[PDB]
A paper describes a structure:
To elucidate the structural basis of the interaction of the reovirus attachment protein σ1 with its carbohydrate coreceptor, we prepared a complex by soaking crystals of σ1 with 10 mM α-2,3-sialyllactose, a compound that terminates in α-linked sialic acid. The subsequent structure, determined at 2.25 Å resolution, unambiguously demonstrated the location of the carbohydrate in an unbiased difference electron-density map. The oligosaccharide binds in a shallow groove next to the loop connecting the second and third β-spiral repeats. The σ1 protein contains three identical binding sites, one on each chain, and all three are occupied by α-2,3-sialyllactose molecules, with the sialic acid making identical and extensive contacts in each chain. The lactose moieties face different directions, probably as a result of internal flexibility and participation in crystal contacts. Arg202 forms a bidentate salt bridge with the carboxyl group. A single hydrogen bond links the hydroxyl group at C4 to the carbonyl of Gly205. The amide of the N-acetyl group is engaged in a hydrogen bond with the backbone carbonyl of Leu203, and the N-acetyl methyl group is facing into a partially hydrophobic cavity. The glycerol chain lies parallel to the peptide backbone, forming direct hydrogen bonds with the backbone carbonyl of Ile201 and the amide nitrogen of Leu203 and in some of the binding sites water-mediated hydrogen bonds with the Asn210 side chain and the amide nitrogen of Ile211. The α-2,3-sialyllactose and α-2,8-disialyllactose ligands assume an elongated shape in which the lactose groups face away from the protein.
At the virion five-fold symmetry axes, the trimeric attachment protein, σ1, extends from pentameric turrets formed by the λ2 protein. Reovirus attachment is thought to proceed via a two-step adhesion-strengthening mechanism, in which σ1 first engages widely distributed carbohydrate receptors with lower affinity. To enhance an understanding of mechanisms by which viral attachment proteins engage cell-surface glycans, we determined the crystal structure of T3D σ1 in complex with α-2,3-sialyllactose, α-2,6-sialyllactose, and α-2,8-disiallylactose. The structure of σ1 residues 170 to 455 reveals a highly elongated, symmetric trimer that measures about 200 Å in length.
Residue numbers in the entry:
A (entry chain A): 166 to 455
B (entry chain C): 165 to 455
C (entry chain B): 161 to 455
Write the structure that this text describes.
């Protein structure tokens, strides 16, 4: 006659009419009750009536009872990356050059045509103009060489007369003026001897020109052509030791040959005479150039 | 006196034929003879440190307010890389620099009339010739003075006409013509003519007789057709009736150019009765018109 | 056994077991519950915990998380998209610039420094060379857009209305003349008209006072010779002057030249050719030229 408990299955056990329960770590006594033991704080908690897992709600969420990352935890990142992607420089076209390693951007330039200003600005390399005399640099700009516009010199030499067997020479001191493309030889008045109706007066430029003027500087632009250039009247006083009679003769530049300028002197009739008084005469003609 | 004790039990305990047993669902099991929590596999749960704990990579996660939270260090590398780019990078380009945001290509806009890219990828200014106006011209590569302006020679073969006080006559002559800088020089030779008046005109007809490429217009003075007294000078003219000429000192000047005809005034110095005149060679010069 | 009270079966129990009126029960905290007749772990809601595979398991997205050494670990693939997008930018991007290229690191704006005098940005936004007027010096000048010769240098005309004064061995007098003036290249030409004067000597001076009488744009200084105030024998020529005392003129072939310009007065020398007794002089028209001073 017994209706009590005389044996028990694990985790229950009986000793001397007293029953106890064996518990592994994880299960514990809480007051009079059996409880799940959760040491420390590892995201597990007894709450809302049972065992739950706890997670930051800004970083995590539960989807089909699975722990899942909140898609927003990445938004800040993708936002910053999308900001750069939408508009940035990845490649550069010449003259632009991009070193993909040091990520430095520079530009290729021709050093003969372009340069870098002290203030880092791109400037066109200034160049001096290529000029040919009489065009020249005048106080910094493209101008006309002063030497072309006016050059003064001097000739101290021999004038020779020759006509119909009559011959004689005189020495003159003469200013020379070169102005643009003309030379002017300013012969002074002088005395000579008999002259023919027609004859030539020769200026020997082979010697007597003041340095640095040279014989070749007196060559006409028509070189050694025979011309009738600069024709004019000259009044020459003819006498035989008394009052001279003035004859109106015709004079022109006739020919330059090897540094000797020949002038023709003819016309106006003549008289018997032994001496001639010549006026100052300026003789001009276009000058040779290179 | 018998104390017979427990005779019934409530779930999860039950008694049958004097034996008590405890029923268990999955999750609860026996570890020997002790009650235990069942954790199949490896899902982050473990019995450790006295009980049930959740396990996590300590470099990626931390526990804050007993809440599983992402450790910030996890993003440190991402934040450093993006920050390194953000601090300095090109997002926009100002002209002439151009940025195509859809291809990430940076190029530059250049005017192809003044600039270009050479064979070595360098930016170079186009070579350009100076813009020059005659008589300034290119002389052997440089900016110089046109040789043609400095000296040009031609020739006129034509008629000089005298006119004075009902006297008229003509003489065919040839004459070299020299144009030098802004002057023209017409080099007439000596010639014989007929009776002249005390005062009168000598006219050169340039409408014909000029040697190509010279044209009539090239003989126009810089003062055009105004009446002037230019290049006044003395000319001795021999007058006679067949005998020995008597030379009159007359006064000659350029008076007017009209329709290709250059008129020279010739007057002064007196006159005598005569039928013939011996004219000296005369050079006529004046500043010449230009464009 | 003299024991006054005999215990049979189970008469007491340790917590969590308890006995009331011969019934044994189990006390349970939240987290433990009854599923039918069985003890069960209670998992309220859905928080990643589940009874499955025979026990208590934790559930996680298998694309985002993984288990290493029974630890919850972030699956490395979840940052792959981010690491590639960033890396793509890294391999090639402009971080810095070298002058004249200029990058504002704070606005992400790239531009280029240029000289405003030698370079410009045209209408179509291109970089173009600034068209610049060449540095010229008169008489070289701009002529309809090209480097040319100033028309003013090539030919300029005016007039002098003034006094010509004769002086010579006591004989002196003056006459008013209107004279065209032409300046051509580096020369000045004074075109004196014919005029009448009084007694002249064998040698004498004819002076032109340019201090007054010049018509603008000409000024006195414009008549200075290129040889300044040197005494010269320039442009020497023959001039026939008619001498008389009321009757028939006798024409003397005299010799005239430009001799000296001083303080705006151009002095011409007139000598030679003999002379006679006379009270009147009939001068011809005479053009006087010389090279002109410049700057
Ligand atoms: C996630 C968590 O909170 N874990 C706790 C656990 C769980 O709450 C428990 O395992 C669920 O069954 O408990 C831990 O022990 C604490 C717990 O027993 C409570 C119960 O009241 O007492 C805490 O300290 C008490 C202490 O008993 C008193 O003497 C003291 O005067 O007051 C304290 C509280 O103010 C226990 O420490 C555990 O280790 O299992 C603590 C975990 O953090
Ligand atoms: C995270 C982890 O380590 N999971 C283990 C678990 C847990 O450690 C365990 O549930 C905590 O209580 O153990 C696992 O292996 C056990 C499992 O096969 C059970 C099934 O009943 O048997 C266990 O051996 C027991 C056995 O059941 C008893 O008869 C014996 O008297 O005691 C043994 C020791 O407790 C295994 O250890 C599991 O699957 O639950 C393996 C997981 O990896
Ligand atoms: C993570 C999870 O699944 N949580 C469940 C839990 C766990 O399954 C359980 O605690 C583990 O032991 O169960 C919850 O209760 C549900 C559970 O008891 C089932 C058992 O079959 O019944 C559900 O009630 C339903 C029932 O299924 C229907 O037959 C009935 O007609 O309607 C009821 C609902 O009105 C329980 O909801 C729990 O809260 O512990 C539910 C969790 O979501």
């Amino acid at each position: 006659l017994n209706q009590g408990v005389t044996s028990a299955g694990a985790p229950l056990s009986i000793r001397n009419n007293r029953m106890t329960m064996g518990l592994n770590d994880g299960l514990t006594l809480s007051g009079n009750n059996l409880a799940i033991r959760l040491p420390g704080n590892t995201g597990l908690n007894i709450q809302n009536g049972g065992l739950q897992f706890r997670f930051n709600t800004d970083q995590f969420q539960i989807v089909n009872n699975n722990l899942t990352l909140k898609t927003t935890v990445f938004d800040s990142i993708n936002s910053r990356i999308g900001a750069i992607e939408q508009s940035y420089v990845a490649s550069a076209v010449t003259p632009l050059r991009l070193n993909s390693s040091t990520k430095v951007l520079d530009m290729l330039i021709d050093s003969s045509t372009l340069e870098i200003n002290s203030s880092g600005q791109l400037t066109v390399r200034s160049t001096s103009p290529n000029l040919r005399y009489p065009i020249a640099d005048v106080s910094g700009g493209i101008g006309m060489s002063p030497n072309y516009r006016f050059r003064q010199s001097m000739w101290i030499g021999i004038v020779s007369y020759s006509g119909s067997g009559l011959n004689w020479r005189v020495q003159v001191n003469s200013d020379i003026f070169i102005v643009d493309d003309y030379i002017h030889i300013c012969l002074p008045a002088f005395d000579g001897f008999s002259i023919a109706d027609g004859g030539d007066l020769s200026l020997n430029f082979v010697t007597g020109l003041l340095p640095p003027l040279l014989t070749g500087d007196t060559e006409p632009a028509f070189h050694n052509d025979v011309v009738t250039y600069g024709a004019q009247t000259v009044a020459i006083g003819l006498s035989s030791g008394g009052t001279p009679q003035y004859m109106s003769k015709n004079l022109w530049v006739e020919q330059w040959q090897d540094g000797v300028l020949r002038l023709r002197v003819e016309g106006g009739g003549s008289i018997t005479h032994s001496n001639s008084k010549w006026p100052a005469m300026t003789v001009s003609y276009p000058r040779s150039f290179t």
